[PDB]
Each structure stands twice: as C-alpha cells, then as structure tokens.
Ligand binder design. Structure first.
Ligand code: H17
Length: 185
C-alpha cells in the first residue's frame, strides 16, 4: 500500500538513537505525514506572533527536551500535543532522520510520524497562529524565490501564500526525496 511503502522507505534512513546521548542542548521536531485524497502531505505550523524566537514563521511542531521525556521521540510528541492537540495514539513514529547541528552547542533531532486520518488540529493560539498541509510532491517542484532559496506555497482552498525556508524547507525536501523518488505511476 501507499502507507506501507512510505514507512518501508523511511525505515532505511532511520539513524535511531546513535546521536541521542551526546551532551548537547537538545530539541526534537515532528515531521507529520498526513494522507488526504490518495496522496501524502506534510503538516506545518505558523508560529504565533507572540513568540520570542521567529514569530510568524513556518515551522514543524517540536521544542526543547525536558526532564520528563523518556527519549527524544517523546519530546517531539509532547510538544506536538501542546501545540496542535495531536495525541500519542494519533501518531506512529516511524523513524529518526539526521540530526541538525546549530550554534555549536545545539542538536535538533527530527522524527517522521504518520498521523491518523481522523486527527483534526486544534491550534493552541499562544504558540501557533495557523496549521496547514502541503502535498509532499510539491517539494520536488517548488515555487522558488531568492531573498538563499525560499519556497512559496499557495493553498488552493483559500489562496493563502506561505513562505517555507531554512531547515524547515530542507527537511521537507529530504522527506519528499525519501518517499517519492523512483516510483512507477
Ligand atoms: C525552526 C523551524 C524548523 O522547522 N526547524 C527544524 C530544524 C530547525 C528548526 C527548529 C528548531 C527548534 C525547534 C523547532 C520546533 C519548534 O520549536 N516548533 C514550534 C512550532 C510552533 C510553535 C512552537 Cl512554540 C514551536 C524547530
């Protein structure tokens, strides 16, 4: 099936816990995959204008690990619940992709998660201004704008344009390559 094929592809890139004990300031992100209309989509948030770091920007759900988290996957799931109401039974964590190093002392670990078809986002307005889907295939032929390369995605439901950039854009491309490369039609 489409979903069984996605997970099998993703598993080949799972680094697991290889890098998880290293003594960094640790954050985790969830790359949430949603199946709609026969196709895979990624779910993105728009960060609240209130927030200190990067108000109003497109981001994946996630945040800083805390002492309650059993592991890095737990951080991602705790934060996704807080931000968009995603509950643990509504997500299967399929793998841990390549961690992102920033600022010399910070390590951000990305987890890809398959989201239940009945999940409906409840944006928490103190953290998240908006939630939207992008078809995964968009990231193979994005509308590129230079400001370094920025993606512009216009939701055909409502005509709203979102800008996706930086590691958010990078991770999205990675996931699209993993799952969609070399597929019969
Ligand atoms: C910054 C954009 C991005 O997607 N990436 C992936 C790698 C780098 C960066 C990131 C750094 C550190 C935490 C996070 C995840 C987070 O903080 N989400 C978030 C969303 C919406 C409300 C809130 Cl409160 C948080 C992400």
């Amino acid at each position: 099936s489409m979903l069984d094929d996605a997970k099998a592809r993703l598993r080949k890139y799972d680094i697991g816990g290889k890098y998880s004990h290293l003594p960094y300031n640790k954050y985790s992100v969830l790359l949430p995959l949603v199946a709609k209309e026969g196709k895979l989509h990624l779910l993105f948030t728009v960060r609240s204008e209130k927030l200190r770091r990067a108000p109003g920007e497109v981001c994946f759900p996630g945040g800083k690990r805390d002492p309650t988290d059993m592991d890095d996957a737990a951080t991602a799931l705790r934060e996704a619940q807080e931000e968009v109401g995603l509950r643990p039974h509504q997500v299967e964590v399929v793998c841990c992709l390549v961690p992102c190093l920033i600022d010399t002392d910070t390590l951000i670990t990305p987890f890809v998660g398959l989201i239940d078809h009945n999940f409906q986002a409840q944006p928490n307005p103190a953290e998240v201004k908006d939630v939207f889907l992008v078809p995964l295939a968009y990231f193979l032929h994005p509308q590129v704008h230079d400001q370094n390369h920025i993606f512009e995605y216009t939701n055909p439901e409502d005509g709203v344009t979102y800008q996706i950039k930086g590691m958010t854009a990078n991770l999205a491309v990675l996931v699209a390559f993993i799952i969609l490369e070399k597929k019969p039609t």
